[PDB]
Design a protein around this nucleic acid. Structure first.
Ligand SMILES: [Mg+2]
Ligand SMILES: [Mg+2]
Ligand SMILES: [Mg+2]
Ligand SMILES: [Mg+2]
Ligand SMILES: [Mg+2]
Ligand SMILES: [Mg+2]
Ligand SMILES: [Mg+2]
Ligand SMILES: [Mg+2]
Ligand SMILES: [Mg+2]
Ligand SMILES: [Mg+2]
Ligand SMILES: [Mg+2]
Ligand SMILES: [Mg+2]
Ligand SMILES: [Mg+2]
Ligand SMILES: [Mg+2]
Ligand SMILES: [Mg+2]
Ligand SMILES: [Mg+2]
Ligand SMILES: [Mg+2]
Ligand SMILES: [Mg+2]
Ligand SMILES: [Mg+2]
Ligand SMILES: [Mg+2]
Ligand SMILES: [Mg+2]
Ligand SMILES: [Mg+2]
Ligand SMILES: [Mg+2]
Ligand SMILES: [Mg+2]
Ligand SMILES: [Mg+2]
Ligand SMILES: [Mg+2]
Ligand SMILES: [Mg+2]
Ligand SMILES: [Mg+2]
Ligand SMILES: [Mg+2]
Ligand SMILES: [Mg+2]
Ligand SMILES: [Mg+2]
Ligand SMILES: [Mg+2]
Ligand SMILES: [Mg+2]
Ligand SMILES: [Mg+2]
Ligand SMILES: [Mg+2]
Ligand SMILES: [Mg+2]
Ligand SMILES: [Mg+2]
Ligand SMILES: [Mg+2]
Ligand SMILES: [Mg+2]
Ligand SMILES: [Mg+2]
Ligand SMILES: [Mg+2]
Ligand SMILES: [Mg+2]
Ligand SMILES: [Mg+2]
Ligand SMILES: [Mg+2]
Ligand SMILES: [Mg+2]
Ligand SMILES: [Mg+2]
Ligand SMILES: [Mg+2]
Ligand SMILES: [Mg+2]
Ligand SMILES: [Mg+2]
Ligand SMILES: [Mg+2]
Ligand SMILES: [Mg+2]
Ligand SMILES: [Mg+2]
Ligand SMILES: [Mg+2]
Ligand SMILES: [Mg+2]
Ligand SMILES: [Mg+2]
Ligand SMILES: [Mg+2]
Ligand SMILES: [Mg+2]
Ligand SMILES: [Mg+2]
Ligand SMILES: [Mg+2]
Ligand SMILES: [Mg+2]
Ligand SMILES: [Mg+2]
Ligand SMILES: [Mg+2]
Ligand SMILES: [Mg+2]
Ligand SMILES: [Mg+2]
Lengths: 158, 134, 263
RNA sequence: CGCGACCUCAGAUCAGACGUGGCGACCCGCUGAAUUUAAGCAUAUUAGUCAGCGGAGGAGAAGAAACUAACCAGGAUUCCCUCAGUAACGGCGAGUGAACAGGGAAGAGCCCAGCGCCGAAUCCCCGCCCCGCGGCGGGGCGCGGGACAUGUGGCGUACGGAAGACCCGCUCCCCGGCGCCGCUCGUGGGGGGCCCAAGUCCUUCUGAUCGAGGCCCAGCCCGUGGACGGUGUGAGGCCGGUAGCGGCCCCCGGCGCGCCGGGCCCGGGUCUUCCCGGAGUCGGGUUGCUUGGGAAUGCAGCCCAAAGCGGGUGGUAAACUCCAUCUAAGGCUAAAUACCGGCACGAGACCGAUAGUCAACAAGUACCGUAAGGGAAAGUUGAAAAGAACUUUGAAGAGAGAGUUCAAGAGGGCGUGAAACCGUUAAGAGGUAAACGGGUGGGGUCCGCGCAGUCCGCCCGGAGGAUUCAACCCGGCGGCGGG
RNA sequence: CGGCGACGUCGGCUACCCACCCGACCCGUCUUGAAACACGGACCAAGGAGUCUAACACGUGCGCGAGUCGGGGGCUCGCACGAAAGCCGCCGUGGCGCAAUGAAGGUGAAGGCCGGCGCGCUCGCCGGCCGAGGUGGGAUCCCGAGGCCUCUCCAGUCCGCCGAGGGCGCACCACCGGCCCGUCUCGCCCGCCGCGCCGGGGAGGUGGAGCACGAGCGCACGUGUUAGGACCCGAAAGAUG
RNA sequence: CGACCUGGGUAUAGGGGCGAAAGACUAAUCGAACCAUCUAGUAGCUGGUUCCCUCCGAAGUUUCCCUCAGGAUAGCUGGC
RNA sequence: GCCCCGCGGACGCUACGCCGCGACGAGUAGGAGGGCCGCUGCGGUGAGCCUUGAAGCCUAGGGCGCGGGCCCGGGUGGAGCCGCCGCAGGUGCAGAUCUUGGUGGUAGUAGCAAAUAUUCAAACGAGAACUUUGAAGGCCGAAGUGGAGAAGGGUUCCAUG
RNA sequence: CGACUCUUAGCGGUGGAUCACUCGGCUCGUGCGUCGAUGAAGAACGCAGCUAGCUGCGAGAAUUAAUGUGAAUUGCAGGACACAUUGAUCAUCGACACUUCGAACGCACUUGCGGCCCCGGGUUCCUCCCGGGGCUACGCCUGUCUGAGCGUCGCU
């Protein structure tokens, strides 16, 4: 019964909730587990950049968020074409193609091609046979600059 | 302080393992300290007890210097019987009083190939530990 | 408790024509349990009243500003000498109670030289008080793995660990702290402020960048500055015997006027 | 009126394999209530839940848009925060109730059919020997059998693809062991075994000590070890352990190059010429269930039943016309996520034998019931059995001595040993049942080591002693003050 | 001021027993009314009943404050404690607050004074300043005529106390104006890339959980409601196998 | 000597059986068996609801309700 | 004339404390405050207590407190326990035809009454109304209190002790 | 004075509270995440010098081998056990073994009744009996063999 004055409340507790009560006592344990999984993954791909491929710049798709920009799923085939690389060697290098994204604006197209060309200039490529450098790089950069990048490959800012 | 996460410090777990430990682990439990001259001739601080080794008692009612020979290791009851560590029950007969191997001290080893080998292993391990902590 | 405790029975409530209480009784007929009362908080073998659940809200979140507030308060109280003494820390031959040392002690490696440092620094009476304080607990904690209890000793608050934890860590009562990550549960052990602390020079210099002065903010907390005082001079005796207050007062009434007897 | 070939079937203790059943905490597919709430009750709610049935795996399901959206657009699935108790559903009552965007965890993409080209290029089985065995393949040989043109393989799948020229780049893959690496990262990669500091020092307490004092030089000794357990009590140093990129010995693994062994052989841009898709399915009507989905969210039955610049979607039914977005009716897929079963561990502001599991113990046992099923009670001698020899009474149980023990005022259901109830002793009392509240009195048990009764500040007198009192001088230290 | 004090006595109201006088029916419960011929209670031990979660509401305490809050995630030697703690800031996404109103398209909270001029028309043109209006109460504070003195007088030097009156008026209350949104009634102007079935404005009433120099957010505790077994025990029933 | 009595074997199972019909019988249970689960089902009704002092201290009336053994509301109370 | 022959002059004020004055004091349901009332565990603190005796229990012993309760003495016992500041509850019993366990009065009471019946002697034996043997008197009376089986029981069968 | 009854105290019973203990639970967390026709889960019946339960095991039956370990097990007995011409016990477990039911598999659930092929005995090839061994369930897949059809055809 309502006492004097208050909200009309509707608690959704009519449905045998305390079998499907879910607790979070394993939250520190799963944080430790994810942390050591990230560490294991990084030292497995030890020279590769520790977080995944480079992601593109992506405009958020609503009049609430279409002033901001964020990392997207992947680069598209048109801007891969203008960058001048093949859509399979791109994923072997670390570029994260996404084929189903379109480009309806040359400004976003040119921004992502410039970003792609910048990454390609920034990339150090190891040779296949280390005694026989076919077309990869010179041993100077291969020795001094073989360091793992932590965090996202070049991040997306507003 | 213990830090190894796989070894427990639970009192009930430690008591349970101590009480139903198997026989070779019970032997390792029922190890006993050596005398100082024995330690000096060897380099070993303690030793698992044996059937036919002389020993003397340092605690309790039968404390003394009488070097009695061990006659029984009752690992079931975690006790040992020595030659003259006895009491006379009502019948006039005598029974061995059992005491603890952590409350005796070994004065002469029943020596054979395996005991020379394990004394060598213990002394060698203490020597490698000393040269490491040089 | 277990969610099935007291409820794996199948007891029925036996009607009301029989001259027994209407509690649910164990159904059967061949054992002691047969016809005994079940399910109730008052029955032997039933379930407790309101069985405790795991989703009991064990944890409590505190505002970061208040946790930092509590840290700053405990640090100031550690600086004050009467408050450390009042925790009972045996500081009488210590010189300069905010006690700061070199970094060779951060480079220490052995318990012998750590104990020697504490003897030379005159904290060994606090350590001996801890040793004398070691005794058994009273109650069920002994069965529940807390046999032995003892006092708290000083904290060592370092900046780098080059063996200092291992050089310590065996002397009883000694808590190592690492100034960058500071814990109120170890700076105010019972909820009481005033624990004895020994600092290194690197940690003692890092403090002023960890929490900032008032003229500048902290450089390692980003948005944090020290809380302000509500009373800048906490000296009531000085303020009340100051001549301005004394000039503004009136004269005291020190004559007690007890009840007259009505003749 | 025979002999073949195929098709469609049958038989076999034919040669070789595979399925069944269990468990079910989590997962998937169905089926699916009523108690309850609505202060009645029927729709609603409970609830797509319990019960029921089937099928799995270490996860499963899902999953690379016939998507969201309407923006300057995003971009598989799963999970968390938020959206949000909101849009919406609802005797619009009670109640119910998502999604997108955004921030994160994780992050991975692919393969057929069809359309076409290549002398079926393809696959299975059986013998020969060679190179191997240790989850059994490599290639060669067979004028050896079968599958298969009623379509196997290679290219190739919506992000387009194929074939000719023209130009450019000569660019380098996979699988098996040998050998030793890297000595194989949280430092060993994993499993197993065996070890590794320092008091039983001196004196005392005790039944026993792990108790209590002490141990020159800052000092018993070690400490990267002062967790814990045992041991006649409370033990860093008695013992096992504990700490340590501490040691030693076996077995297994992922691993880099010098081989050998086998295969495996051309990629990209320009133009030209071609080729392009899943049907009793979509969709429509109707019915039933379902959903927040409301003039149909999904699913299913029945009927009707497509198209190819088509089809689907664009949260109000319909027509016309623009635009946006995807490409259904085929298939695979790790991670992040779940886990009251199991194997093995660790911990706890939890319970402490009427509690905590039903179960600390010969517990799902004894016992009950025809059966489905129901289901207890029950821990503690002592440090050590040293568990009471022997004498004596009794037929014995049971006693009396004696003996062990620190203790039997611990004697095999034996720690402590309450209350109810009872026996005996002592004291008191007693015809309005006892008991009770106030107020006295009498008796008794114990207590006041009750029983000559204070203490102590000043000065007076006596009789003793002894440094030395004041005052100076020297040294030290504090407090206060100093333009 | 008196008496008496060790193998006999002094004190001990509290404690055990007994005696007498007065008073006194057995508790719990429901009930207008219980000693009741109302029910439960032979006795004793032990167990035995408002709890926890979620959501609100108000009160209180603490921190920050027009903001507040990391709760999810991530970064930190090798994880005794530590499953803790610390940190992030281009991790503040987001929540709640900072703006309301309307069913919705939508719209969306500052006035006065001084000057000139139309027609200073109940009112535009520009310019100048000031900055949430006014009235009545209003804790506190400010000025304050005049007073109160000193061995004593003459001319002022310093501060002290009382003080009639006056002044600015906090919070808050009452009222009166104003402003925003919805909706009526009346009426005339203005704007343009689209001269429109366009857009904007005024006056006067009314509906609003509004504004009118912010008060919130987070945490903690209490109390009260609620949904959950829901203070504990209790049906006759219903359903599935 | 009969629509007779009786053993064993078989068959019918819970809104079902079986009944020369009494709602009889269906394992001491029958106007719907037993067993487990849903389930600690719901109860405006009965009973109970555990330490001490201090301070304040009621109502049985108003209106509405498928309401009359109940609630909401206003009064009466307490606390800040 | 800055005191002095002197060098001196009680207690107090845990300010959440102490002191003064005046008025007042019923209480169910209920509300609120205080609790140096009580229970169990946690963080601190008591250089706390304890085998020269902890907890628990008993007490014609001594006391305190309005009370909740608490302290001390004596006995018993034989290993742990408490005080203060905070923290947290499965935290206080006379009731519930409460639950489990135990024990009373009743009460040495009701009862040991269906089917006709026993008696004498001996033996064994510590011990004989009841065992065994002998003698007598009786009963079942062949639709049996007799001799065998089926279901069911599961060793009850038989010797010895 | 008895007795009887009531109260209090001491002692002694009855009874098993209290306290202290804890090889047990409960709760949370972690890593693994594995059953079966090559016979599982479960059941039955056996097995020890003295052994009923519990536990372990399977006619090799409170266990064999092997490997680590290194002198016991223990309530009593027994005889082993040079510890190098080789080792008690315990642990590990990779070799071997593993009765009868049970998805349970020749049929059937009675320890009932078979069938086929080998081996040995009685035979003194000839099979009659006895013992032993190997097969003998259902569904399904690929291949093989044997077939059926007035199903569709070819050569007469
Ligand atoms: Mg229980
Ligand atoms: Mg206790
Ligand atoms: Mg076959
Ligand atoms: Mg209802
Ligand atoms: Mg109702
Ligand atoms: Mg009804
Ligand atoms: Mg189910
Ligand atoms: Mg299956
Ligand atoms: Mg899958
Ligand atoms: Mg799939
Ligand atoms: Mg909200
Ligand atoms: Mg629903
Ligand atoms: Mg990531
Ligand atoms: Mg093909
Ligand atoms: Mg596709
Ligand atoms: Mg040692
Ligand atoms: Mg010990
Ligand atoms: Mg120890
Ligand atoms: Mg180690
Ligand atoms: Mg529409
Ligand atoms: Mg007990
Ligand atoms: Mg129990
Ligand atoms: Mg039980
Ligand atoms: Mg059980
Ligand atoms: Mg005793
Ligand atoms: Mg005793
Ligand atoms: Mg006893
Ligand atoms: Mg008595
Ligand atoms: Mg009543
Ligand atoms: Mg009533
Ligand atoms: Mg009445
Ligand atoms: Mg009454
Ligand atoms: Mg009457
Ligand atoms: Mg009644
Ligand atoms: Mg009664
Ligand atoms: Mg009762
Ligand atoms: Mg109780
Ligand atoms: Mg944290
Ligand atoms: Mg914000
Ligand atoms: Mg924002
Ligand atoms: Mg005003
Ligand atoms: Mg107004
Ligand atoms: Mg309220
Ligand atoms: Mg209830
Ligand atoms: Mg409730
Ligand atoms: Mg019930
Ligand atoms: Mg019904
Ligand atoms: Mg029925
Ligand atoms: Mg009738
Ligand atoms: Mg019947
Ligand atoms: Mg009947
Ligand atoms: Mg009163
Ligand atoms: Mg005592
Ligand atoms: Mg309780
Ligand atoms: Mg009671
Ligand atoms: Mg009561
Ligand atoms: Mg009689
Ligand atoms: Mg009679
Ligand atoms: Mg006759
Ligand atoms: Mg007969
Ligand atoms: Mg007694
Ligand atoms: Mg063997
Ligand atoms: Mg048969
Ligand atoms: Mg034919």
């Amino acid at each position: 019964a309502p006492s004097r004055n208050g909200m009309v409340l509707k608690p959704h507790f009519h449905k045998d909730w305390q079998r499907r009560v879910a607790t979070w006592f394993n939250q520190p344990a799963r944080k430790i587990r994810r942390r050591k999984a990230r560490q294991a993954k990084a030292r497995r791909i030890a020279p590769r950049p520790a977080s995944g491929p480079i992601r593109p710049i992506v405009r958020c798709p609503t009049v609430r968020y279409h002033t901001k920009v964020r990392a997207g799923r992947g680069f598209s085939l048109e801007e891969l074409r203008v960058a001048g690389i093949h859509k399979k060697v791109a994923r072997t290098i670390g570029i994260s193609v996404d084929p189903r994204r379109r480009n309806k604006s040359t400004e976003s197209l040119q921004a992502n091609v410039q970003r792609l060309k910048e990454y390609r200039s920034k990339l150090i490529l190891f040779p296949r046979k280390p005694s026989a450098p076919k077309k990869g790089d010179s041993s100077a950069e291969e020795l001094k600059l073989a360091t793992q990048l932590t965090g996202p490959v070049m991040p997306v800012r507003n | 302080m213990k830090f190894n996460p796989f070894v427990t410090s639970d009192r009930s777990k430690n008591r349970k393992r101590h009480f139903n430990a198997p026989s070779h682990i019970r032997r390792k439990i029922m190890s006993s300290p050596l005398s100082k001259e024995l330690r000096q001739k060897y380099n070993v601080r303690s030793m698992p007890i044996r059937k036919d080794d002389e020993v003397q008692v340092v605690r309790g009612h039968y404390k003394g210097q009488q070097i009695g020979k061990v006659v029984q290791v009752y690992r079931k009851k975690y006790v040992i019987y020595i030659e003259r560590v006895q009491r006379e029950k009502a019948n006039g007969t005598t029974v061995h009083v059992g005491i603890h191997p952590s409350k005796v001290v070994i004065t002469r080893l029943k020596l054979d190939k395996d005991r020379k080998k394990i004394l060598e292993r213990k002394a060698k391990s203490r020597q490698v530990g000393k040269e490491k902590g040089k | 408790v277990s969610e099935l405790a007291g409820h794996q029975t199948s007891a029925e409530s036996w009607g009301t024509g029989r001259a027994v209480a209407r509690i649910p009784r164990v159904r059967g007929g061949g054992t002691h349990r047969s016809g005994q009362g079940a399910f109730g908080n008052m029955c032997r073998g039933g379930r407790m009243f309101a069985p405790t659940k795991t989703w009991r809200r064990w944890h409590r979140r505190v505002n970061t500003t208040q946790k930092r507030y509590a840290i700053c308060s405990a640090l100031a109280a550690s600086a004050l000498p009467a408050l450390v003494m009042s925790k009972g820390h045996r500081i009488e031959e210590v010189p300069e109670l905010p006690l700061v040392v070199e970094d060779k002690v951060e480079g220490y490696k052995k318990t012998k030289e750590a104990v020697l440092l504490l003897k030379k620094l005159k904290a060994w009476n606090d350590i001996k008080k801890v040793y004398a304080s070691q005794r058994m607990r009273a109650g069920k904690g002994k069965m529940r793995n807390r046999r032995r209890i003892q006092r708290r000793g000083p904290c060592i608050i370092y900046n780098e660990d080059n063996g200092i934890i291992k050089a310590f860590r065996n002397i009883p009562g000694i808590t190592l702290l690492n100034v960058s990550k500071l814990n109120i549960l170890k700076l105010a052990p019972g909820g009481h402020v005033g624990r004895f602390c020994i600092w290194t020079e690197s940690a003692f210099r890092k403090l002023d960048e960890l929490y900032g002065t008032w003229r500048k903010a902290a450089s390692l907390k980003s948005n944090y500055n020290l809380p302000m005082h509500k009373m800048i001079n906490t000296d009531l005796s000085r303020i009340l015997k100051s001549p301005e207050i004394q000039r503004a007062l009136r004269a005291p009434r020190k004559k007690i006027h007890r009840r007259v007897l009505k003749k």
